[PDB]
Amino acid sequence: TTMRILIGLLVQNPELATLVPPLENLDENKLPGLGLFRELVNTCLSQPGLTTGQLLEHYRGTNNAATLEKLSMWDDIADKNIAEQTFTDSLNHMFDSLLELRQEELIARERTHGLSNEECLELWTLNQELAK
Amino acid sequence: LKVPPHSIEAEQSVLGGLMLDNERWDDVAERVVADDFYTRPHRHIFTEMARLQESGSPIDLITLAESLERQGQLDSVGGCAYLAELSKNTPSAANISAYADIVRERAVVREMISVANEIAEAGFDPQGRTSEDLLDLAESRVFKIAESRANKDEGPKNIADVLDATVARIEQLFQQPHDGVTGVNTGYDDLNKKTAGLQPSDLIIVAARPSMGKTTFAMNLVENAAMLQDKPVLIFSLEMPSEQIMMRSLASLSRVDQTKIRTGQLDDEDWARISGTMGILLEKRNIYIDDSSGLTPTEVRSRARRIAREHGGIGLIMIDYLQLMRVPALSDNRTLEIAEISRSLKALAKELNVPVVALSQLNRSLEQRADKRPVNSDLRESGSIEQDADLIMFIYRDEVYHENSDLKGIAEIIIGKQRNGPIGTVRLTFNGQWSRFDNYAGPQYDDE
Amino acid sequence: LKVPPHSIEAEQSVLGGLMLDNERWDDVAERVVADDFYTRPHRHIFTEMARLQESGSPIDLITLAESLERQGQLDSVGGCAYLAELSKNTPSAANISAYADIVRERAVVREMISVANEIAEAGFDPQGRTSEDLLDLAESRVFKIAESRANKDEGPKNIADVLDATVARIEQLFQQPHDGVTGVNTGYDDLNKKTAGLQPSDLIIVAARPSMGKTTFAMNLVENAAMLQDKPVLIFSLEMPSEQIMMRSLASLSRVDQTKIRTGQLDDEDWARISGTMGILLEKRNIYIDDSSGLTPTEVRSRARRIAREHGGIGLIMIDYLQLMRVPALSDNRTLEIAEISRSLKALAKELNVPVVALSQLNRSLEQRADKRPVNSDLRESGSIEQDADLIMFIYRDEVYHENSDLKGIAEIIIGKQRNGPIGTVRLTFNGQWSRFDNYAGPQYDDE
DNA sequence: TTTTTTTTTTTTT
Ligand SMILES: Nc1ncnc2c1ncn2[C@@H]1O[C@H](COP(=O)(O)OP(=O)(O)O)[C@@H](O)[C@H]1O
Ligand SMILES: Nc1ncnc2c1ncn2[C@@H]1O[C@H](COP(=O)(O)OP(=O)(O)O)[C@@H](O)[C@H]1O
Ligand code: ALF
Ligand code: ALF
Ligand SMILES: [Mg+2]
Ligand SMILES: [Mg+2]
């Protein structure tokens, strides 16, 4: 669901794709079908100063262009500056998956064979960032 | 099966954004209500959020879930898992206003569809109701939906513009050099001075005991307005047929005895005056009369709108009189019926922005007091009438209750209520021979 | 197996917030105790947190885990995993106060359930205890619950306080009799003295018969508050359009004949006064008006929240008037609708912590009494308005009901109900020419 | 569940 919103926002306003913080190091296996989003972000970053049609026509060789076109119309709003905050919030939510992974693995290791002082300390440090 | 139009995505987005930002609740609050949500779980969720926010509590996943569980409604809304899904699916509350507007659109469309279906069902099965009843029902149903959308305007937005507009309007009124009367001239110097005429949008109630000439004074004001303006004037003579009202009007205008006109014992000069009055009226054609009895506010409003559209507005409206009007929906409680009638007439006056003189009658307690001069307390079915009444004038005649009165031929118009002006007594000459009121030209009595 | 009422989520949120924000321990310390946590591990964790705070150590995951392990109770709670989960599952510690309040609610409800269980057990087995003994046991058990109610003072002040007040006043007669204004200034010396200004969070109901200057008095109060404060004030003029209200305000401020203002018969000096008033008002921009018709309480609340958030609070709210407000849900019973409106407005005043002058109207029965001075029961639907109202002020004018009255130009503001102050009459000079009230400078009449 | 109306019988001024 969130992936559909992210893709729709990315396709609707290709200009904002230049403001995306780097996410190349992140694995695409965490979120479902995240490879399409990362590929779209990299492609849109490669050509700053573009229109929505020229971004849409890029993936005409593949069969996933229909999804991009159907998502672009969806969640369409006239105001431009309003969408930047929503996109930023979605990006922050997506980036929070890394902290989610890190705390989940630490909790799993705690349940498997416990944790030492430093391990629970780093778990606490990671968890403090989740609330804020 | 034609599914009702709806947008689950907009509702979910609003629900999630409210959990993410309580501050924008106001933006959601003035745009959407609980009943708007197509899905009942969303209705319950919105109700619980409103209850919590009204208490000052923060609208969040945990507090909302526990609040629903306190009423056993959590599992009815999909549970904590569904609430977490709603919280997650919303990225941010920036576009929450658009989502609320979309939800409002869908809800109003479903309401329109429901009203249309009900009207169609009634048409298929009138259950003995005449066509007029069904058409009036459809009128009311459509008008309700039309009025239910008046939520974007009429609010206390940034005052500066409102103050500037009001001051500009005041300056415009000042610049227009009127002769003291800024509204419909009443035809009487003292009454116009104290009232500045019958103002637009204002509800005026003229009252007195029966036989006091209340209808006489009303018709005199109507004639003055018609002669002093070209805009039409509308009369609802529920009390009397149009024939007697027109006979009174001719007697007053011609200053000929009403008895002779009623009896037809008219001489050549009297008939000449009558013919001149008829010619003047036929030249004006700014008067419309309805003698239909039992007229409800709905029919009065519809006919007023018809006349205004056909003639570009109405200068004045006249109703004879309030207590005769019918509201079957409130027939059980007479007081509630009268309050509804008065409020509807006030609303109609504001909408058409025209003076509306609706006549009224007093309780008998007045005549049980030592002083028989009417006051505000004396109105019958009284409480709501005075509240909706913007101007209140009572008609008194000491000669009526005192044969040896020195005020024979004199009538007291007591302005008892005036929002933007002084209250007090005025005197007029009453020619019951002609059923007319005239400016008082005797010695001026100082009002103590 | 009816589980005792509880909230795992609330306790987990409170514990996680304490792990996250130690500064909010005090806000939690007053609300809840260790016993209030339904689950024993949460009781242990809160006890350890209290012990650490008392010793001054910070409350975090590492310190709490170390302290619990040192006591051997770490296993009883779940270790680093469970405490990390407690810290994790809390959306934010900013709402820890609400979670603590909910936990206190659950604890009080569980205490009540336990009390009921004990009373039922005693009833099943009196053990020779008389019915009086069982009743006294139940009453003693219940009185523990009602410790958070109290009764405060009811009026009886002892001889020592009387002597102290008498000495203070006898000494200050030589000195300056200051008022002690703390609330929003009413603009009048006597009214401020008796009320100490419009108290925030307190509901004030100004009532009067129509035409008594109710709206006039409210507008004068609002204007005085605006000129004596910088916080914005708010008005809901359902009864009248904004234009008439603004004209009244300008006429009062400029002390010019409002009739001239309405008619546009304004001279150069009056025009200069009007221009100065306009300049002052456009300089302030601390007054907001809504000319909406048929506002529901929710709409008023939302709009007030909007204005307060935009301008950081509201100095004063005014509603004209209660009987105009609409509640479609309770339209069936008028009294219930009025009661709910009053309750919602009182809750709004408490939440916004602002004085709220909501106007009300009286039943005609008042004028049936020999003395027409209003009293509390004279309110229409007095059942709920009187209960909710914290301050009740009635406007009376003997000149209105007696033209030969010796109090001409004098209006009586009678504080008939005041929770935190004395009831009694106050006099003001009413200039109907300007539609204004002024401090009464005439001879003081003994309040008998 | 309430506001009206308006009888009737009393008191009080
Ligand atoms: N020929 C006449 N001479 C004197 N007075 C008359 C004559 N005809 C009608 N009137 C007066 O006109 C009044 C009109 O009465 P009516 O319309 O019933 O009063 P309202 O409209 O206030 O109920 C009567 O009270 C009567 O005194
Ligand atoms: N030009 C004037 N001269 C004297 N008094 C006036 C003037 N204009 C208005 N008033 C007084 O102002 C009062 C306002 O009436 P209104 O606002 O209807 O009363 P309320 O608001 O108490 O229901 C009236 O009772 C009237 O006596
Ligand atoms: F008797 Al009428 F108006 F004529 F009340
Ligand atoms: F008649 Al009003 F407020 F003016 F009750
Ligand atoms: Mg008549
Ligand atoms: Mg008023």
Side-chain angles (χ1 to χ4, degrees):
Chain A
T1 304
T2 305
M3 280 296 298
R4 305 203 312 273
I5 295 167
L6 274 165
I7 294 291
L9 295 169
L10 182 61
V11 179
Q12 184 58 226
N13 288 13
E15 305 295 348
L16 277 60
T18 58
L19 280 293
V20 175
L23 40 61
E24 282 66 4
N25 65 330
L26 282 165
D27 57 349
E28 65 183 14
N29 187 23
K30 274 281 139 282
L31 284 298
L34 190 60
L36 178 54
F37 171 79
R38 296 167 63 267
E39 194 186 359
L40 285 157
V41 175
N42 288 274
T43 299
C44 200
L45 177 58
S46 182
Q47 296 83 25
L50 70 174
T51 57
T52 185
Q54 84 93 261
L55 182 61
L56 285 169
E57 66 88 7
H58 270 60
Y59 293 177
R60 288 285 126 82
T62 59
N63 64 335
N64 61 334
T67 302
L68 304 178
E69 293 176 341
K70 105 88 167 68
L71 290 164
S72 192
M73 55 78 70
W74 183 57
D75 299 339
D76 173 69
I77 194 69
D79 189 4
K80 282 287 186 178
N81 78 326
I82 196 169
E84 73 91 357
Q85 299 87 356
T86 309
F87 201 75
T88 304
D89 196 340
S90 61
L91 290 175
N92 301 130
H93 198 280
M94 213 291 290
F95 294 142
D96 194 9
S97 302
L98 180 140
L99 292 74
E100 198 76 354
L101 192 177
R102 190 154 271 95
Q103 58 84 10
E104 269 173 358
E105 262 54 11
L106 290 167
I107 293 166
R109 196 158 57 84
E110 172 53 29
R111 190 183 296 91
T112 305
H113 62 75
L115 287 181
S116 302
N117 307 122
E118 198 282 336
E119 309 306 331
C120 195
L121 153 60
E122 59 178 18
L123 173 53
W124 172 70
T125 63
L126 267 287
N127 180 23
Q128 287 289 128
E129 303 175 358
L130 297 172
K132 301 184 295 305
Chain B
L1 303 176
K2 301 177 180 177
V3 183
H6 58 290
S7 179
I8 305 304
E9 284 70 1
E11 302 175 17
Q12 295 170 337
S13 306
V14 171
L15 292 177
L18 288 174
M19 302 176 189
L20 299 168
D21 187 1
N22 283 246
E23 300 178 359
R24 285 191 184 84
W25 165 263
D26 303 12
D27 282 8
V28 187
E30 197 167 9
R31 288 178 173 80
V32 287
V33 291
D35 308 331
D36 305 336
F37 294 88
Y38 163 80
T39 60
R40 194 175 189 179
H42 293 176
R43 304 175 200 177
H44 296 354
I45 292 161
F46 188 91
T47 306
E48 204 71 10
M49 288 181 176
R51 194 179 67 81
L52 285 169
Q53 193 68 5
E54 289 155 17
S55 58
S57 307
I59 291 161
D60 61 76
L61 168 56
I62 292 167
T63 59
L64 182 69
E66 176 160 3
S67 186
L68 295 172
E69 188 172 3
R70 273 170 275 184
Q71 300 181 359
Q73 301 172 0
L74 174 56
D75 297 338
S76 61
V77 296
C80 294
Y82 193 85
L83 298 171
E85 181 178 358
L86 292 177
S87 179
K88 179 178 177 180
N89 294 18
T90 298
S92 181
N95 299 325
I96 196 169
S97 292
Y99 307 145
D101 301 320
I102 292 160
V103 170
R104 182 182 183 181
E105 198 74 357
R106 302 305 182 191
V108 172
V109 177
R110 290 195 310 279
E111 182 178 359
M112 187 188 295
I113 293 162
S114 174
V115 165
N117 298 325
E118 291 171 10
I119 293 161
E121 183 171 4
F124 280 111
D125 184 9
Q127 305 171 357
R129 280 162 295 174
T130 62
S131 48
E132 299 182 8
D133 301 329
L134 305 179
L135 301 179
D136 301 4
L137 181 61
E139 281 272 28
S140 180
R141 297 280 179 179
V142 171
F143 177 80
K144 285 171 180 179
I145 307 166
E147 187 175 2
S148 59
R149 302 303 311 276
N151 315 331
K152 300 156 265 58
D153 63 328
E154 41 77 44
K157 302 182 181 183
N158 181 260
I159 192 76
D161 304 326
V162 179
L163 281 161
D164 298 338
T166 307
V167 171
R169 177 54 173 177
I170 293 160
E171 294 164 8
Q172 180 178 3
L173 294 170
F174 160 80
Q175 281 137 28
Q176 293 151 354
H178 309 280
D179 64 329
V181 190
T182 63
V184 176
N185 193 335
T186 64
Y188 305 93
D189 303 332
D190 301 4
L191 181 60
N192 293 325
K193 289 164 183 179
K194 279 196 179 296
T195 60
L198 314 183
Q199 317 306 338
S201 316
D202 296 17
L203 183 62
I204 310 96
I205 307 306
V206 173
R209 296 298 306 168
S211 318
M212 286 290 172
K214 182 190 71 164
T215 307
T216 320
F217 182 74
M219 293 305 306
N220 297 132
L221 290 179
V222 169
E223 294 165 39
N224 301 335
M227 297 296 172
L228 299 175
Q229 90 190 322
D230 297 331
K231 285 186 177 181
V233 307
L234 179 57
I235 293 166
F236 290 95
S237 175
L238 291 79
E239 189 178 14
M240 297 168 57
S242 304
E243 180 178 333
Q244 303 190 33
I245 303 302
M246 188 57 62
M247 285 194 297
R248 281 191 179 186
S249 178
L250 294 170
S252 174
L253 295 169
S254 62
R255 299 186 181 278
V256 182
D257 194 341
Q258 183 178 359
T259 304
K260 292 187 174 183
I261 291 163
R262 180 179 56 175
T263 56
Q265 299 179 348
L266 302 165
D267 60 67
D268 304 325
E269 183 174 356
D270 299 3
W271 184 237
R273 293 180 186 179
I274 290 160
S275 305
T277 306
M278 291 156 44
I280 293 163
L281 294 171
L282 294 163
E283 186 172 3
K284 276 274 180 166
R285 300 210 176 183
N286 63 345
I287 294 166
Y288 300 86
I289 298 168
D290 182 10
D291 53 0
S292 301
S293 59
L295 293 170
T296 74
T298 306
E299 283 198 3
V300 173
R301 163 165 291 194
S302 177
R303 296 173 198 193
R305 289 189 188 186
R306 170 175 174 182
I307 295 297
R309 182 175 63 269
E310 290 183 7
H311 301 74
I314 294 165
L316 176 69
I317 294 169
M318 188 274 200
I319 294 168
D320 183 6
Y321 54 90
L322 288 163
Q323 289 75 347
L324 305 181
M325 293 186 69
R326 292 296 199 176
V327 179
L330 305 179
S331 57
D332 306 336
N333 182 306
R334 187 64 172 178
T335 303
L336 289 174
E337 161 167 10
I338 294 294
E340 178 57 23
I341 291 161
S342 193
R343 189 180 294 92
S344 299
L345 292 174
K346 175 54 170 168
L348 179 62
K350 289 189 75 174
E351 186 199 336
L352 307 183
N353 190 24
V354 62
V356 184
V357 174
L359 312 186
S360 203
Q361 288 162 328
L362 310 177
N363 287 326
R364 300 246 160 169
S365 58
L366 173 159
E367 303 192 34
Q368 291 189 357
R369 303 178 303 187
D371 183 8
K372 296 181 177 61
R373 282 179 175 74
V375 304
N376 305 339
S377 63
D378 300 317
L379 293 162
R380 183 175 165 182
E381 291 94 35
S382 331
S384 56
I385 294 170
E386 174 171 2
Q387 292 170 346
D388 280 330
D390 304 60
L391 171 56
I392 303 173
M393 292 180 282
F394 296 101
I395 321 192
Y396 170 80
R397 296 173 62 188
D398 177 58
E399 58 185 336
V400 169
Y401 306 109
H402 306 84
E403 302 182 12
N404 302 330
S405 177
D406 297 328
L407 303 176
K408 289 178 178 180
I410 304 173
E412 300 178 358
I413 308 305
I414 301 169
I415 301 164
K417 184 180 183 180
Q418 189 169 352
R419 292 181 171 179
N420 307 328
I423 58 175
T425 307
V426 183
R427 292 178 177 78
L428 296 172
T429 305
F430 172 66
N431 295 265
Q433 57 184 14
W434 306 332
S435 309
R436 186 167 179 80
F437 283 103
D438 303 327
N439 292 272
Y440 176 85
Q444 292 182 346
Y445 304 88
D446 305 331
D447 298 1
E448 293 185 356
Chain C
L1 295 172
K2 244 196 215 177
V3 184
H6 60 274
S7 178
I8 302 301
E9 283 69 1
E11 298 181 21
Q12 292 174 345
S13 310
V14 169
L15 295 175
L18 292 175
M19 295 163 187
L20 294 153
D21 187 359
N22 319 137
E23 302 165 12
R24 291 192 179 86
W25 168 266
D26 306 333
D27 304 325
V28 175
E30 187 179 6
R31 289 174 171 84
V32 300
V33 294
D35 307 327
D36 294 331
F37 300 84
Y38 175 76
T39 65
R40 198 177 180 181
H42 291 171
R43 301 190 174 190
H44 297 344
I45 294 161
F46 181 87
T47 307
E48 181 53 47
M49 286 177 175
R51 191 179 72 85
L52 292 172
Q53 176 57 20
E54 297 145 29
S55 58
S57 301
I59 290 163
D60 59 74
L61 193 71
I62 299 162
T63 55
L64 178 57
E66 184 186 6
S67 205
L68 295 165
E69 191 177 7
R70 284 178 286 171
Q71 300 172 0
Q73 302 176 4
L74 183 61
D75 304 331
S76 60
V77 293
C80 171
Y82 188 83
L83 302 175
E85 180 175 10
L86 293 179
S87 173
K88 173 183 166 192
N89 297 348
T90 306
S92 176
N95 312 270
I96 195 172
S97 298
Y99 309 147
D101 297 315
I102 293 164
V103 168
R104 185 180 184 176
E105 184 75 351
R106 295 298 194 188
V108 169
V109 171
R110 288 194 306 277
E111 181 178 356
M112 189 224 298
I113 291 167
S114 181
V115 164
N117 302 330
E118 292 169 346
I119 294 162
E121 184 175 354
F124 273 103
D125 185 6
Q127 302 177 356
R129 297 177 193 181
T130 68
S131 62
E132 301 173 3
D133 302 325
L134 302 174
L135 291 170
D136 293 326
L137 182 66
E139 289 182 14
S140 65
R141 298 270 184 180
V142 171
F143 276 127
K144 301 167 180 178
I145 259 166
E147 65 185 357
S148 60
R149 278 186 169 83
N151 71 328
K152 300 92 171 180
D153 70 325
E154 279 63 25
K157 67 202 305 309
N158 69 335
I159 216 305
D161 296 5
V162 171
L163 294 168
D164 299 3
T166 300
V167 170
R169 178 142 177 77
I170 291 164
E171 291 177 0
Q172 92 194 145
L173 279 168
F174 173 79
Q175 314 181 13
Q176 317 89 41
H178 71 273
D179 301 12
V181 181
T182 57
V184 176
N185 195 330
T186 68
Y188 303 88
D189 302 332
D190 301 2
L191 191 63
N192 293 327
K193 289 164 181 176
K194 277 193 178 296
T195 61
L198 309 178
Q199 311 309 326
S201 309
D202 302 13
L203 180 63
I204 308 97
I205 305 303
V206 171
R209 299 297 303 175
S211 318
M212 287 292 177
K214 182 184 68 148
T215 304
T216 312
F217 178 72
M219 287 302 303
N220 304 134
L221 280 177
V222 171
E223 294 164 43
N224 300 329
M227 298 298 158
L228 300 176
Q229 90 187 311
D230 295 332
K231 282 188 176 180
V233 305
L234 185 55
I235 297 161
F236 291 92
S237 174
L238 294 74
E239 186 175 350
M240 300 164 68
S242 296
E243 184 177 356
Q244 302 177 9
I245 299 301
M246 190 53 48
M247 285 192 297
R248 276 179 165 179
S249 177
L250 294 173
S252 175
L253 293 170
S254 64
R255 300 181 177 280
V256 180
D257 193 337
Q258 189 178 329
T259 301
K260 285 186 171 185
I261 293 161
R262 182 180 59 170
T263 55
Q265 296 180 351
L266 299 167
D267 61 71
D268 298 338
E269 184 179 354
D270 286 334
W271 195 245
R273 293 181 186 181
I274 291 159
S275 304
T277 307
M278 290 153 40
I280 294 163
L281 293 165
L282 298 171
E283 184 185 0
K284 284 274 182 169
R285 300 198 179 186
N286 67 343
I287 300 168
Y288 296 82
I289 300 168
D290 182 9
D291 55 358
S292 292
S293 57
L295 287 173
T296 69
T298 303
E299 301 161 17
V300 171
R301 170 168 297 190
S302 177
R303 293 173 171 189
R305 288 174 172 178
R306 171 177 171 186
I307 298 298
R309 192 187 67 264
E310 287 183 8
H311 297 66
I314 293 165
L316 175 65
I317 296 168
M318 191 274 200
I319 294 167
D320 185 20
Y321 49 94
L322 290 176
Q323 287 75 353
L324 302 182
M325 296 191 69
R326 291 298 202 179
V327 184
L330 299 177
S331 60
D332 300 333
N333 189 328
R334 184 64 185 170
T335 302
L336 299 177
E337 166 164 21
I338 295 292
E340 190 62 19
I341 290 160
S342 186
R343 184 181 297 92
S344 303
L345 293 176
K346 177 56 177 171
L348 175 60
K350 291 185 73 172
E351 193 167 6
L352 298 177
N353 189 24
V354 58
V356 184
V357 176
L359 304 180
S360 186
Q361 291 159 340
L362 319 177
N363 292 346
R364 303 243 157 169
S365 55
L366 168 150
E367 304 201 31
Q368 303 174 346
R369 308 178 303 185
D371 188 4
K372 300 173 181 63
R373 288 178 173 78
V375 308
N376 306 333
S377 62
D378 293 326
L379 300 168
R380 188 166 171 180
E381 289 81 54
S382 55
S384 56
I385 301 170
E386 187 171 356
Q387 298 172 10
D388 290 336
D390 304 66
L391 172 58
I392 305 175
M393 296 190 287
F394 292 102
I395 319 192
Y396 177 84
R397 291 174 64 182
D398 179 62
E399 58 180 356
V400 170
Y401 303 110
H402 302 81
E403 298 186 1
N404 297 337
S405 179
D406 308 329
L407 308 177
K408 286 183 177 180
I410 313 183
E412 308 178 15
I413 305 302
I414 299 165
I415 295 162
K417 185 186 174 186
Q418 190 177 1
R419 299 179 177 179
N420 314 330
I423 54 168
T425 307
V426 183
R427 293 177 176 76
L428 296 170
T429 304
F430 169 74
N431 303 90
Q433 58 186 7
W434 309 326
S435 305
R436 184 171 179 81
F437 293 98
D438 308 327
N439 289 263
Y440 180 83
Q444 290 184 349
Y445 304 90
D446 302 332
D447 297 7
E448 304 181 5

